Design a protein around this nucleic acid. Sequence first.
RNA 1: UCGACA
DNA 2: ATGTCG
Length: 133
Amino acid sequence: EEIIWESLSVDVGSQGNPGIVEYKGVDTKTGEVLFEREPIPIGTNNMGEFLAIVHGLRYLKERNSRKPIYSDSQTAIKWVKDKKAKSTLVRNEETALIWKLVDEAEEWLNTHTYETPILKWQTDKWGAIKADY
RNA sequence: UCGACA
DNA sequence: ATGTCG
Ligand SMILES: [Cl-]
Ligand SMILES: [Mg+2]
Ligand SMILES: [Mg+2]
């Protein structure tokens, strides 16, 4: 019910779906952009949302930060919890990059630890997540 | 058959 | 429209 302002908010941005995908993480309190992924030619909204959360985990772990991560993606939050991105996007030469990043994200998750709470951003009550495009 | 999150 | 889960 209470927004945890001392947190990291991440979100995907795209042009088409499947389409060009990117993501960024921002300080929930100030909106300051902390990281941003170079656009990936072809990917899905959910893969991007997943990549954004995993990058956030890696970003916070490297800085010894225990702050939670906000995401508005029910799908991505579940994929991270399961440490498995159940995407339906076809695996071919054109989607090789997005799949490589997804596979590497999964790989990282299955070989590292973290206590970072991954929280659902309550869009219907709080408005658009701060990392929204 | 939807409902929900994007 | 398309991507996903309950
Ligand atoms: Cl990535
Ligand atoms: Mg989103
Ligand atoms: Mg958004």
